[PDB]
Amino acid sequence: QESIQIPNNGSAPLLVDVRVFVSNVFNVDILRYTMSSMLLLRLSWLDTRLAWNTSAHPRHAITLPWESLWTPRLTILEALWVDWRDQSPQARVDQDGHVKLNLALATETNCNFELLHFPRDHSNCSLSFYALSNTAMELEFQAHVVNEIVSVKREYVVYDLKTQVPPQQLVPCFQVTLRLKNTALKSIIALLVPAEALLLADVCGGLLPLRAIERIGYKVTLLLSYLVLHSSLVQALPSSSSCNPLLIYYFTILLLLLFLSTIETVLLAGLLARRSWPETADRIFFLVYVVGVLCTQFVFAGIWMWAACKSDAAPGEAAPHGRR
Amino acid sequence: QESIQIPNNGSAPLLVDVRVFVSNVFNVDILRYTMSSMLLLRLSWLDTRLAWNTSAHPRHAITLPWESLWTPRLTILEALWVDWRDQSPQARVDQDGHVKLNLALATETNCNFELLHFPRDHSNCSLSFYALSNTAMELEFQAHVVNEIVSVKREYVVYDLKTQVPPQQLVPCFQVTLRLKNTALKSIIALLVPAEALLLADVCGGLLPLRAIERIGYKVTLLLSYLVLHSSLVQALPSSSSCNPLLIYYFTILLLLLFLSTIETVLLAGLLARRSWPETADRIFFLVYVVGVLCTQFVFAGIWMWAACKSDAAPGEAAPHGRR
Amino acid sequence: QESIQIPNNGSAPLLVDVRVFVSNVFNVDILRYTMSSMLLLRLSWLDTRLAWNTSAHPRHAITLPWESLWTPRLTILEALWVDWRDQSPQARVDQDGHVKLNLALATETNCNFELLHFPRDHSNCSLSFYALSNTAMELEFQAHVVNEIVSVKREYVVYDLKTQVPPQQLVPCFQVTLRLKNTALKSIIALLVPAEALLLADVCGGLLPLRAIERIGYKVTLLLSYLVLHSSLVQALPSSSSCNPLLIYYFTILLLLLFLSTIETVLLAGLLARRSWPETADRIFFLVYVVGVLCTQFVFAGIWMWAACKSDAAPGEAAPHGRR
Amino acid sequence: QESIQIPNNGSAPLLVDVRVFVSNVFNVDILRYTMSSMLLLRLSWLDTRLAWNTSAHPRHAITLPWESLWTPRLTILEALWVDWRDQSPQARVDQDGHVKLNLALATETNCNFELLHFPRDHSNCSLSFYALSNTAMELEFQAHVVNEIVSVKREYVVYDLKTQVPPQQLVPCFQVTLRLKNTALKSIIALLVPAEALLLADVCGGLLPLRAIERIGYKVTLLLSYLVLHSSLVQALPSSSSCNPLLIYYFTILLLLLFLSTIETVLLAGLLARRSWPETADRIFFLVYVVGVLCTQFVFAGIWMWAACKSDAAPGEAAPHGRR
Amino acid sequence: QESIQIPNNGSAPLLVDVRVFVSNVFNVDILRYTMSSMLLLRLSWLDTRLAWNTSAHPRHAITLPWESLWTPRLTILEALWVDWRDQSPQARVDQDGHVKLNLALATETNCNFELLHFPRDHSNCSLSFYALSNTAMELEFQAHVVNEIVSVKREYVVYDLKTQVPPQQLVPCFQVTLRLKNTALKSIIALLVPAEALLLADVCGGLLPLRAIERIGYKVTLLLSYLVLHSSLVQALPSSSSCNPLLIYYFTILLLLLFLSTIETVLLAGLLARRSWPETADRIFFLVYVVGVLCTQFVFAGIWMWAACKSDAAPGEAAPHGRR
Numbered sequence A, B, C, D, E: 001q002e003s004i005q006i007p008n009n010g011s012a013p014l015l016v017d018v019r020v021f022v023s024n025v026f027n028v029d030i031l032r033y034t035m036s037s038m039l040l041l042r043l044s045w046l047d048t049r050l051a052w053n054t055s056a057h058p059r060h061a062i063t064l065p066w067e068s069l070w071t072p073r074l075t076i077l078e079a080l081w082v083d084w085r086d087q088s089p090q091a092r093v094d095q096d097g098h099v100k101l102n103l104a105l106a107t108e109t110n111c112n113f114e115l116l117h118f119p120r121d122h123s124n125c126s127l128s129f130y131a132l133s134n135t136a137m138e139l140e141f142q143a144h145v146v147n148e149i150v151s152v153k154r155e156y157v158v159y160d161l162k163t164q165v166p167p168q169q170l171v172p173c174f175q176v177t178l179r180l181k182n183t184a185l186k187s188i189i190a191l192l193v194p195a196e197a198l199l200l201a202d203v204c205g206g207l208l209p210l211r212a213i214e215r216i217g218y219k220v221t222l223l224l225s226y227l228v229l230h231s232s233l234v235q236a237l238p239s240s241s242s243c244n245p246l247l248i249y250y251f252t253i254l255l256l257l258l259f260l261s262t263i264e265t266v267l268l269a270g271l272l273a274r275r276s277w278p279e280t281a282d283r284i285f286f287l288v289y290v291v292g293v294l295c296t297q298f299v300f301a302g303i304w305m306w307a308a309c310k311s312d313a314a315p316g317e318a319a320p321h322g323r324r
């Protein structure tokens, strides 16, 4: 039964060098706050118990089944599900005892996206591989990451990748940290351009005379169009506890402005139908509405330039598993 | 074959200490009444049959396969599906016989959400781990829960977590109870603000003269917009047998009010087209409609402050499995 | 190899007592005609070959792996997929040879819903557990069902549950029959109330004068709203070969009535624009339309009270597998 | 190792009689061109090596595990995925060596639907079970199909089922061919009735005077409604390379007719606003439009009665695997 | 343990001839940039260690389990998931040692679609089978591809298929390259025809007199219809980092043109309501708008004829795994 036990390096723990290849990051679901990726793990260690004399066996390398020798059972905390593409992998051992294991896996880890600057949000995602069955006094990890992404024409671009070993740990683990940036133009063209166009159309329609029947229908049809667009936006975005995207607030403000414009138009038209004072009030409100639209644009730009997504760290991140 | 039998503690049943780490609760589907979570179970017990003399074996801890020793087969009643991230886990046994087993799993349990106060609903979810293959006279559980959630910026926040052992049980089991509260602003901004804005717009449009063609089209377009919004809301919410969300009732009342306003406007305009009495009736109806809108808002607020979701307990909850 | 053979009861077949616990019925997909449920099967039988003397073995009960002894391989015909939550279950055997096996499974069986009275449809669902590997002369089943549903606040309520053993069978099987009733208010509030409100609005708008431009736009906007509502309804319901829901027919009739009203309004307005006769025709058509709407409501109520869903039995139900 | 080898029938290949029970065909996804079904395969053959003397063993039938004897490994070419409901099935062998194997499986095969006559499309679906590990000189199949469908109230009805053995084959295989016919009324009521109603409404609205403001809005609102309906239809149907459904062409023609009517109305109203000649042109265009609508209906009916879906056979169907 | 080791060809590496049958390519998800396919791999090699004398064993071919002999463990880098339809396949070995292995698998690989010319996009997809457990000095692959696609009536047509062995490789691998072309008419009829029709309708409605109330509502209703169509298009297409489809840009330009037309109409109508100069400005703008629409059509045609999708190669494609 000793063949499946972890090799002894002596006083120091056994060293396992892990090479991580990020084949692709294909799914980035902000609604579920999940990131799906494909990884290749090449784990190399030394097991002198498996060394054999070259004279007896002419082969310079042999393949052993996954359960015939000690292999580090890696577990990912953030991964919703892990699909190992090799159900029964094999370990390659040479005459000097160096064991190499290749594992191809697909995971859907949990990533805490910072959606404050949607659709240009920048987030940090982490994949923490833990060897729960072992202890830090027996197992040590050296993690290297190679950026071998095969799909680059995606909405989210992985530009920074690195590996680290959290110090002062009880469970031996290594963390692969990558950075996601959104470069998709679908959201912008889909929502922002129609929203700004509708706002400009409402501002222009404010110039129609107060006693024109063609104005109320115009305003209400624009209001319905913006309601549909706002519903599409809000259903296309998730809601956070504290740090929500600024786009939902901006669209809410614009929708309130459009509702205020429609309400003012209808109220003043009704009062007029009952230069007259309502027409002067309409002109003053039109000037104030144009000024308010410009001020709202400038204020939102300033907020975007000086916004802070200051959500507190999660209990798992504040106290990582297997620390101290 | 005795190596896989449950260890004997004597007259008292064997004690297994279970430490539960809630890594994340990522999916909360009110439509399916399901809650998906990731858990790490650390089960520690004593098996003196596995103890070995330290002189013979220099190792202070060994790893055994899942099927080479007795391990408690845990089953979750509420879980729609259980995905164990380790198909063949290993148990760590030291020289004194203390066996530790780490199991990482992902489940989609069934949670009875109290959706009465949507979108601020507060619910209790339960995960009951049962050892169906054993009996209470042989197995005992001590359950501890650690709140190590890695994703805190979610729509639903897990704020209270605890563990318990239901007394007077035949099947040894332990229950992990957590509390979910909804803090998502997506539903509010998506539906309530547009609904209130449309209601206010309809009230304001009630001030238009009865003999204005611009009024009927205005009312009908607002009615169509609110129909679309109501359809979106009802398709965005599930239906319960007795305790339904108050939002669907509130939106139904508002939709009926808008339909009544449109019907009154059209009927009075038609009768006028056939101060005249219909205009006086329109003014009286406008005053009554404003008063009724305010009264409906106050009544709904009072109902929300004094509503009771008094759904009877389910047969499974009333009579838990493996009791008496 | 005899340890995995079915125990011999003698001339009579072996008796296996099955206790079925219905933990939850969570998904009821009328579109796919599927019902998903979670079940716990407790199968108890007698295997005297496994009995041991209490003097030799102090244990009063032992656990054996799933493949170390004969266990009935149960197969569900209606189940689209079966997920056994215990991949390698264990059987508990006492000193007297009584073997007990607990199996927790999740299935998505096929249920023939009677959607004639949607959204108040009442249907019978069946789960037929077959022991295909055995014969009726060797295996017999006693099935008991316990209603331990943990989720009661669902759209569909399971109120009647029972078990039966189909007589004159070649393959030993037992059938669990449950009854589903729909109590969801989502469909009603979503569709019926807006549909009736739109119909009443169209009837009221029929009172507008024939030579009013505000009438045609009103009618067409209501027609568009009802077209959207009808599309939502038909996409929210499945289509059967013969016994379709009465709601689709009712909405089709109402849509045809609205189209007829709009067509009459437009035709008469055009003819008038080319007391005049078209106005008298419009008044007569309005009276006939109100009478027809009331008659349609009464006729649909009568049909609902006296409708028969007389779909012929399926070939599988007419000739169950393993009969005669 | 000879116990897992295929039994020798002599010069002639071994004969395996396969009985196929089609429990249900639940999913028919025209968008993915897939058909999901549940099947029970009863494979009976003769293995004289497993025969035993009745005097030694009193049992008249024994059960052996799936890997303890030779069993034909069946593979389905068209199946996207195969879910065997029995992971480790058992084979029943009597004293005379007759081995019977029952396999319950669920598959999602690829079916080439002939969607030319949607929603009344008639298609042929095929499930080809191949024994890739064997050769035709060693294995032979006799396939029988029993129509035991448990769900008959579906959109698609399976009315013809048969089995065949493709002659001149290298890989022993048997093909189960079924015929699907669509009887769903959801598509018809959802799309065709509203489309015809909107077309009739547009024809009737063509009678409005050219100098009426109520006509342009009427035409444009009908155009928007038909645009929504056409979008729903095209998103509810898939696109083929050559043989597309005639419904998409019919709806495209109707949409072009509605656009032409709206364009003519607007152009003539504008020219008139700048008996007058535009009114005479409008009357002539109305007559021509009614005649063209009737002619389009008749032409589409004739095309439907004399349409040929002449898509060439796929390379897989033209040259089946394991032929010659 | 030597029975599972790779056979030795001598100084030269072992040669494995791989025959690839592409049964079907059923899913092409541009949103996820994925291509799903079904493949049959026939791997033939020589293992003289398994040869046996024909005199001792009369059988000319035997079947061995997957784990009883050396088989190349193939891994696909681009595949999101691999479903092997045979969990425990068998290898056929004749008396001369020629081992043949048949593997039926279904994969969802990652394909970098060139969506510049949507919906007539042409893309290259690759499936790279890697033998990670072996080295190039021990294993060599000869790959042959047979186009046996069973479903030809799909949106995407596979017209070119080939196999290659990347030279100067450390990990033995073979790449199957296929070409996808889109022939679906669903996108064209769904979006382009309604978009062009709406643009033509807006151009025609520009001819309405500036002082007509029927013009503003017409323009705004067309604007709402095109907003809905544009939203449908953008939600029906994915967004790339650099090389986006030209259709989204074209629809954005058309939407901006429609917004400009509506804004000009409303502004000029308002200024007129406060030959007059606004009417002359409206006529000049109408001429300029027609000229601009024609110029935009010609410019987009020229761009389509002279567009370059020059996205840089992904890091995985630039540096393939196991090279040098």
Ligand SMILES: *[C@@H]1O[C@H](CO)[C@@H](O[C@@H]2O[C@H](CO)[C@@H](O)[C@H](O)[C@H]2NC(C)=O)[C@H](O)[C@H]1NC(C)=O
Residues within 6 Å of the ligand: A009, A012, A013, A014, A015, A016, A045, A046, A142
């Ligand atoms: C046993 O422990 C020693 C020290 O922990 C390891 O030696 C280290 O190897 C790494 C190579 O990545 C070097 O960076 C360090 O400088 C080395 N430290 C010392 C003190 O030598 C050694 O690799 C371990 N051996 C095994 C088989 O794990």
Ligand SMILES: *[C@@H]1O[C@H](CO)[C@@H](O[C@@H]2O[C@H](CO)[C@@H](O)[C@H](O)[C@H]2NC(C)=O)[C@H](O)[C@H]1NC(C)=O
Residues within 6 Å of the ligand: B009, B012, B013, B014, B015, B016, B045, B046, B142
């Ligand atoms: C055997 O049974 C005894 C009593 O049931 C267990 O002793 C208890 O251990 C817990 C530690 O969590 C204490 O809280 C109790 O106070 C103890 N009770 C007594 C009477 O000592 C003991 O742990 C069990 N031993 C094993 C191996 O399970």
Ligand SMILES: *[C@@H]1O[C@H](CO)[C@@H](O[C@@H]2O[C@H](CO)[C@@H](O)[C@H](O)[C@H]2NC(C)=O)[C@H](O)[C@H]1NC(C)=O
Residues within 6 Å of the ligand: C009, C012, C013, C014, C015, C016, C045, C046, C142
């Ligand atoms: C062997 O067969 C006999 C008869 O079929 C079984 O005895 C029956 O047990 C049930 C208990 O549920 C009783 O309801 C019947 O009245 C009994 N019938 C008779 C004639 O005794 C017996 O249980 C079977 N034994 C085993 C181990 O299966």
Ligand SMILES: *[C@@H]1O[C@H](CO)[C@@H](O[C@@H]2O[C@H](CO)[C@@H](O)[C@H](O)[C@H]2NC(C)=O)[C@H](O)[C@H]1NC(C)=O
Residues within 6 Å of the ligand: D009, D012, D013, D014, D015, D016, D045, D046, D142
């Ligand atoms: C061995 O081969 C012979 C001939 O191929 C098989 O005999 C046939 O069995 C079928 C029964 O379905 C009959 O329809 C044929 O008429 C028979 N042909 C002859 C020449 O007899 C025989 O079944 C095979 N035996 C086994 C065990 O496979």
Ligand SMILES: *[C@@H]1O[C@H](CO)[C@@H](O[C@@H]2O[C@H](CO)[C@@H](O)[C@H](O)[C@H]2NC(C)=O)[C@H](O)[C@H]1NC(C)=O
Residues within 6 Å of the ligand: E009, E012, E013, E014, E015, E016, E045, E046, E142
């Ligand atoms: C051992 O190596 C030699 C050379 O690499 C292989 O011989 C080649 O076989 C292919 C057949 O596809 C021919 O195209 C080459 O021309 C051959 N080259 C030479 C030098 O003969 C041989 O097939 C290998 N044997 C095994 C069992 O793998």
Ligand SMILES: *[C@@H]1O[C@H](CO)[C@@H](O)[C@H](O)[C@H]1NC(C)=O
Residues within 6 Å of the ligand: A114, A123, A124
């Ligand atoms: C993401 O990582 C970078 C450095 O790697 C750091 O500067 C930044 O603060 C991180 N952002 C968040 C939300 O953690």
Ligand SMILES: *[C@@H]1O[C@H](CO)[C@@H](O)[C@H](O)[C@H]1NC(C)=O
Residues within 6 Å of the ligand: B114, B123, B124
């Ligand atoms: C939820 O739990 C708290 C205490 O833990 C309790 O007060 C409350 O009544 C529970 N609510 C429901 C619906 O069970």
Ligand SMILES: *[C@@H]1O[C@H](CO)[C@@H](O)[C@H](O)[C@H]1NC(C)=O
Residues within 6 Å of the ligand: C114, C123, C124
């Ligand atoms: C359902 O079951 C009840 C009795 O259990 C029976 O009266 C009724 O006819 C059944 N309905 C159908 C559609 O089978």
Ligand SMILES: *[C@@H]1O[C@H](CO)[C@@H](O)[C@H](O)[C@H]1NC(C)=O
Residues within 6 Å of the ligand: D114, D123, D124
């Ligand atoms: C389908 O099968 C019938 C006979 O079984 C045949 O007449 C018909 O041509 C087939 N249709 C297609 C598209 O293969």
Ligand SMILES: *[C@@H]1O[C@H](CO)[C@@H](O)[C@H](O)[C@H]1NC(C)=O
Residues within 6 Å of the ligand: E114, E123, E124
């Ligand atoms: C696709 O393959 C063909 C030749 O096989 C090549 O000419 C073309 O440049 C390739 N296109 C891309 C985007 O790689």
Ligand SMILES: [Zn+2]
Residues within 6 Å of the ligand: A094, A095, A096, A097, A098
């Ligand atoms: Zn080495």
Ligand SMILES: [Zn+2]
Residues within 6 Å of the ligand: A117, A120, A121, A122
């Ligand atoms: Zn930013």
Ligand SMILES: [Zn+2]
Residues within 6 Å of the ligand: B094, B095, B096, B097, B098
């Ligand atoms: Zn210990």
Ligand SMILES: [Zn+2]
Residues within 6 Å of the ligand: B117, B120, B121, B122
């Ligand atoms: Zn509350």
Ligand SMILES: [Zn+2]
Residues within 6 Å of the ligand: C094, C095, C096, C097, C098
């Ligand atoms: Zn007993």
Ligand SMILES: [Zn+2]
Residues within 6 Å of the ligand: C117, C120, C121, C122
């Ligand atoms: Zn009923």
